[PDB]
């Protein structure tokens, strides 16, 4: 689709699409940029992630509305058919993102910051697949999310300080995985509390701007702990 457009033009248009709140366009521009085959910078990785999180976030919100109506109706075929249509679309977007990570973003990512970022994405998009999966295939999808998050966690704990925002966001999302997907609320609570406490003890090392970045995500961990305890 985007093979004839320059990489730099795809990046520029992804930024314009974000300003215009055109997230499907944004995601298509960033897919085109990934498919140029070069590694992504920190800013470009963020554009890729923001684009797809907005696309799949709208699909997930729609799927939840439709799934609620469908469950109530089971307390014609149209509600199920339309929930299935939205579900298939959502699965297709998740498969597209997972395909970009597998061909070839992860394998070329050698610095800890890029590798953790992509493995967190891989965990997130398997988690969104798990949200709509039913049965034993749900089990293998759940394991794929778990494995991606665990590898990211292992690298992050070895290579990044406890206040690093990607390390923090990874721990936040892995704790949500434990609570919401893996039926492990105590593991969720433990991980959120340990992550929060270890970040708090490292705040003294940070500049004012880094302090703001880290404390914002720490508050999200606290917000989940408040809801869970």
């Amino acid at each position: 689709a985007m093979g004839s457009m320059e990489r730099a033009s795809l990046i520029q248009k992804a930024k314009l699409a974000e300003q215009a709140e055109r997230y499907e366009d944004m995601a298509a521009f960033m897919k085109g940029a990934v498919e140029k085959g070069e590694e992504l910078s920190c800013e470009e990785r963020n554009l890729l992630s923001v684009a797809y999180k907005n696309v799949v976030g709208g699909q997930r919100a729609a799927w939840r509305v439709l799934s609620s109506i469908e469950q109530k109706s089971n307390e014609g075929p149209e509600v199920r058919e339309y929930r299935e249509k939205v579900e298939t679309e959502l699965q297709g977007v998740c498969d597209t993102v997972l395909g970009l990570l597998d061909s070839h973003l992860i394998k070329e990512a050698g610095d800890a910051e890029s590798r953790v970022f992509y493995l967190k994405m891989k965990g997130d998009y398997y988690r969104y697949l798990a949200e709509v999966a039913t049965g034993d295939d749900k089990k293998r999808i759940i394991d794929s999310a778990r494995s991606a998050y665990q590898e990211a966690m292992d690298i992050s704990k070895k290579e990044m300080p406890p206040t690093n925002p990607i390390r923090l966001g990874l721990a936040l999302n892995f704790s949500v995985f434990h609570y919401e997907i893996a039926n492990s609320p105590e593991e969720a609570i433990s991980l959120a509390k340990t992550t929060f406490d270890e970040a708090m003890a490292d705040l003294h090392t940070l500049s004012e701007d880094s302090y703001k970045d880290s404390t914002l995500i720490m508050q999200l961990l606290r917000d989940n702990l408040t809801l869970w305890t």
Partner: peptide, 9 residues
């Protein structure tokens, strides 16, 4: 339970 919103660059 909230994950990272992640929707604004």
């Amino acid at each position: 339970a909230g994950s990272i919103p992640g929707r604004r660059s």
